[PDB]
Ligand binder design. Structure first.
Ligand SMILES: O=c1[nH]cc(F)c(=O)[nH]1
Ligand SMILES: [Zn+2]
Ligand SMILES: [Zn+2]
Ligand SMILES: [Zn+2]
Ligand SMILES: [Zn+2]
Lengths: 478, 478
C-alpha cells in the first residue's frame, strides 16, 4: 500500500486537505490524518497538490505512419507519460484500408502489451464495408472499445469520405460508441499540397500553407453536422483553429453534445516555427493540424475557459530527425507528429494555472476528468474517490522543470518546447497505486500497464435517446 | 420611344422625382419635366415608383428534372415574370453528367430563344474532366457566361463532390467566373431519404425531414471554405436556414466575398406546409431546400437587413399536380420546385417594405441591383441611368393583388402563396424600353428577349488578385 499524507487533494471541482490511501490498485481511503496500515509506504505530500493522474486520450505509440514507425514505443511512451504525471493513455488502432479492424486491434494489443501504465484504444474507421460494421460491434461488445476515430484528411490513404462518416456514425449510434474525428478537409489539403509542390515550395514552411485553418473549420463543421443529423455525440481531436472552435461552440449552443480536444502545442506555439532556417528544426514541428497564426492560440485558450474545449491530449507521435528527413525534398512526406505526453500536464499547469487563465479544478477537468467522463471511464479514472483506480499525480506548485529533448524521457530527439521552463511540476506519479515517478526517478516497468476497457453508452446516449424518441418522424394520414 | 412621366424614381440608394425617357432599348434621358420626342408614347407614373425591373438570377424554365420537364417554358415563364415586374432572368444550363457543356449550352440557348424578356445562363458543373475545364473557358470567353453552378446535393445525379468543387472553383478563379452553389450535403440527404422511406415515411412531410437545415448549413460552410481556400468569391443560391446564413455572415466577417440569395418562399413559409392534410397541397411546396421551421424566416429577414443576404430570386421550377404526383408513393420522386417569378417583387414589397423591415432602396438592391453587381451586369441592368437597358417597373404602392394559381400567369396549377393579398404591385413593366405589362394587360411576345452576356472578372476579382499578390508564399532560404 501507499499512503499519500499531508497533500491538498485537488479535484475537478474542489480542493481539500486529506490523506489518500492506495492498495490493490485502488484508492482505499480518503480523509484527514488517515491511519497507516502496517508496512504501508508513506509519501509526504505536504505543500503539494494531489490530483488524478493525467489521461492522454490521443497517443500514437510506435505507430506505422507515413512510411516509418514512430520512434516512441508503448513502453517508452507510457513511461515518459508517467514521468510527466500522465497515468493512462488512449491510443489508436489504425487499420489499413481493407484491413480487418479486429486483425489490427489484436496486433496493436501485442504492440501495447509493453505499456508501463494503463492504456486503451480508439479504433479508426479507415474504410467501410458490412464487415467493418460487424467488427465495430465485436470491438465494442468483446474488446472494451467505445470510440471510433475517423480521419477526414489523408486522402488516398486512411481518409473517410462523407459516405463512410455517415455509415460509421450510424453504427456508432447503434453501438453506443463515441465517434471521434480528425477534422481537416482532405480534398483541400491534397489540392494545396500538390499546388505548393508544383510551385517548388517543398520546405516545411509550406506545410501550414497546405492546410490553413479554414480546412479544419470546414471539416469540423461537417463532422458536427453529420453527428447532429444522425443523433450522435462527437469528439473532435486536436482542435487548433478559431474556425473549428467556433463550430464547436455553435453546436454546443444548439444543445449538441460536441467535445473538443486541444494540444499544448496548439495553445502555445504559432506557425512561425515552420519558417525556422534550420530544416530539421522546422520539420520537428510538422504535424497535422499544423501550428497556427497567433490569434488561434488566444481563441483556443478562450475555448478552454468557456467550456467549448473539454480535454487536453498530445497526439504523441514521435519521429526523430532522420525520420522527419524523409521529407527533406517534399514537406508532404515529412512524417507528421510531435511529442508531448511527458510535457502536457506541466505545460498546461504553467501556462494556464499560473497565469490565472484556469483554476486548478479546471486543470484537473481538462487533464483527466473530462476525458474520463466523455469516454465512460469516470469515476474509475479522473476521480479521487474510494474505489477509483489509484492513478494520481503529486504536484509541486513551486517546482521547476526545463523541457529539453536532451533530458526528457520521450524517445525522440526533438521537443517542440525545447528550452521552456515551467513552474509547477509532477514530483511523483502513482499508477495502479504504485509509485512509478519519484522526484526524477522513473520506475516504469515494461508490461505493467493494463488494457482498459471502456463501456459503451456513456450517459449522453441516454439524453439523445429521449430526444430521438421525442422527435420521431410521424406520418400524416391522408 | 416611351416616356414615363411624373413618377418617383427609386434606385438602390435614393429616391427623386424625375421623368424617364426610353428609346432603342435604352434609358435615353432622366430629369424633371423632360420634353417628349415626337410620337413618343407617354406613361403617366403619377403617385407611383419607377424602379429598375426585377432580375431573377435563379429560374429553371422548362427544365428536364426528376423524370419530367417543368411545365413553365421560357416564354410563359419570362412573360409571367414581366407581369410581376421582373424584366430579366438568369437560368441554368444543366448538362447531364458526361455531357458536353457547350452542347448543353446550345440546347438551352435553343429552348430559351422563345423568351419574352432578356435572359442569361449560369452553367452547372455536373461532372469534371479536362474537357469540362476547357469548355468552361469557352463559355466565358465566347458565350457570355461568367457564373458556374454546382449542386452539392442530388447524389447519383448532378451532385459535385469536393474534388469537382475544388477543380471547378479553381477554374472559375482562372476565368474570372463566379462560382455558385446549391448547398445541401448530398450524402446526408440521400441517407435520410432512404432511412425515411425504409421507415415507411413516404409522404411530403418526410421531405423536410430528409434534409433538415443543418445539411444546408454544412454544405454552405464547405462551399464557403473551398472558395476561401482557392481565393474565389462565392454565391450561395436559395439560402433557407439560419445555419447557412450564419456561415455566410461568418465568412463575410472574415473579409470573404460571399453572396447569399433568398426566395420569398423561404422568407414567408414554414415547414408546416408539408403536413397539409391534402397530399397535392403538401406536394406543391416540395422543393429543395425545403421550407423551414419558423425561426429560420426571421433569421433570413435579418440577413437581408444586415447585408448578409444580397439577392432575391425564385428558383422558378414549375411542376403541376400530375407531375408532383410522380412521387405520390415516394416523396423523393416528387419533382422538386415551386413557382415564383411573377410573385417575388410583390411578395417582397408587401412583406419587406410595407412592414418597415426594408427601405424601398433595399428593395431595389435586393430585387435587381445587387444581382447585377454580383454577376457583372451593373449598370447595364439594375440601374436607372442614361445608357442602361430600359428595364423598368412602375410600382403602385396602393395597388392590391391576391396571389392565386387560378389567376397568375405562371404556367403551373399551384401557387405557394395561394390566397395571399399583397399591397404594392407592378402596374407596368418595361423591358427593352417596351411596355410589356400594363394594368392587367400582358404583351409578351415569343422570342422578343435577348440573350444577355455577362463579362468575366467582376471587380471583386481585382481585390482578390491584390490579396493573392500580398499573400504569395515565400520559401525559407536554407
Ligand atoms: O500529426 C498527426 N496527425 C494525425 C496522425 F494520425 C498522426 O499520427 N500525427
Ligand atoms: Zn489527427
Ligand atoms: Zn493523432
Ligand atoms: Zn437549387
Ligand atoms: Zn434551382
Amino acid at each position: 500500500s501507499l499512503l499519500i499524507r499531508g497533500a491538498t487533494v485537488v479535484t475537478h471541482e474542489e480542493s481539500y486537505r486529506a490523506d489518500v490511501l492506495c492498495a490493490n490498485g485502488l484508492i482505499q481511503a480518503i480523509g484527514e490524518n488517515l491511519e497507516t496500515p502496517s508496512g504501508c509506504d508513506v509519501l509526504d505530500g505536504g505543500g503539494q497538490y494531489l490530483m488524478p493522474g493525467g489521461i492522454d486520450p490521443h497517443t500514437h505509440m510506435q505507430l506505422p505512419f507515413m512510411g516509418t514507425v514512430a520512434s516512441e514505443d508503448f513502453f517508452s511512451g507510457t513511461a515518459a507519460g508517467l514521468a510527466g504525471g500522465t497515468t493512462s493513455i488512449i491510443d489508436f488502432v489504425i487499420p489499413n484500408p481493407r484491413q480487418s479492424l479486429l486483425e489490427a486491434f489484436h496486433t496493436w494489443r501485442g504492440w501495447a502489451q509493453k505499456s508501463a501504465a494503463d492504456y486503451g484504444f480508439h479504433v479508426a474507421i479507415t474504410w467501410w464495408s458490412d464487415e467493418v460494421a460487424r467488427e465495430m460491434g465485436e470491438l465494442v461488445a468483446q474488446h472494451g472499445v467505445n470510440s471510433f476515430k475517423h480521419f477526414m484528411a489523408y486522402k488516398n490513404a486512411i481518409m473517410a469520405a462523407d459516405d463512410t462518416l455517415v455509415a460509421s456514425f450510424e453504427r456508432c449510434l447503434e453501438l453506443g460508441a463515441v465517434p471521434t474525428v480528425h477534422a481537416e478537409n482532405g480534398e483541400l489539403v491534397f489540392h494545396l499540397q500538390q499546388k505548393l509542390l508544383a510551385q517548388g515550395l517543398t520546405g516545411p514552411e509550406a506545410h501550414p500553407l497546405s492546410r490553413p485553418p479554414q480546412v479544419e473549420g470546414e471539416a469540423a463543421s461537417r463532422a458536427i453536422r453529420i453527428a447532429e443529423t444522425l443523433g450522435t455525440p462527437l469528439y473532435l481531436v486536436h482542435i487548433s483553429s478559431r474556425e473549428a472552435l467556433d463550430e464547436i461552440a455553435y453546436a454546443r449552443a444548439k444543445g449538441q453534445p460536441v467535445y473538443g480536444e486541444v494540444l499544448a502545442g496548439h495553445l502555445l506555439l504559432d506557425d512561425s516555427v515552420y519558417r525556422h532556417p534550420d530544416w530539421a528544426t522546422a520539420a520537428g514541428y510538422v504535424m497535422s493540424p499544423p501550428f497556427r497564426p497567433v490569434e488561434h492560440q488566444e481563441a483556443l485558450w478562450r475555448g478552454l475557459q468557456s467550456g467549448n474545449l473539454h480535454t487536453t491530449a498530445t497526439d504523441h507521435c514521435c519521429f526523430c530527425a532522420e525520420q522527419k528527413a524523409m521529407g527533406r525534398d517534399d514537406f508532404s512526406k515529412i512524417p507528421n507528429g510531435t511529442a508531448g505526453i511527458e510535457d502536457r500536464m506541466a505545460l498546461l499547469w504553467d501556462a494556464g494555472v499560473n497565469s490565472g487563465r484556469l483554476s486548478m479544478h479546471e486543470f484537473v477537468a481538462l487533464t483527466s476528468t473530462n476525458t474520463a467522463k466523455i469516454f465512460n471511464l469516470f469515476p474509475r479514472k479522473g476521480a479521487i474517490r474510494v474505489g477509483a483506480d489509484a492513478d494520481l499525480v503529486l504536484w509541486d506548485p513551486q517546482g521547476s522543470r526545463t523541457l529539453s529533448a536532451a533530458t526528457h524521457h520521450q524517445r525522440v530527439d526533438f521537443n517542440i518546447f525545447e528550452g521552456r521552463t515551467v513552474r509547477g511540476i509532477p514530483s511523483h506519479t502513482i499508477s495502479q497505486g504504485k509509485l512509478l515517478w519519484a522526484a526524477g526517478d522513473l520506475r516504469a516497468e515494461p508490461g505493467a500497464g493494463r488494457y482498459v476497457e471502456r463501456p459503451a453508452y456513456p450517459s449522453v446516449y441516454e439524453v439523445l435517446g429521449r430526444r430521438a424518441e421525442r422527435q420521431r418522424p410521424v406520418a400524416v394520414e391522408r
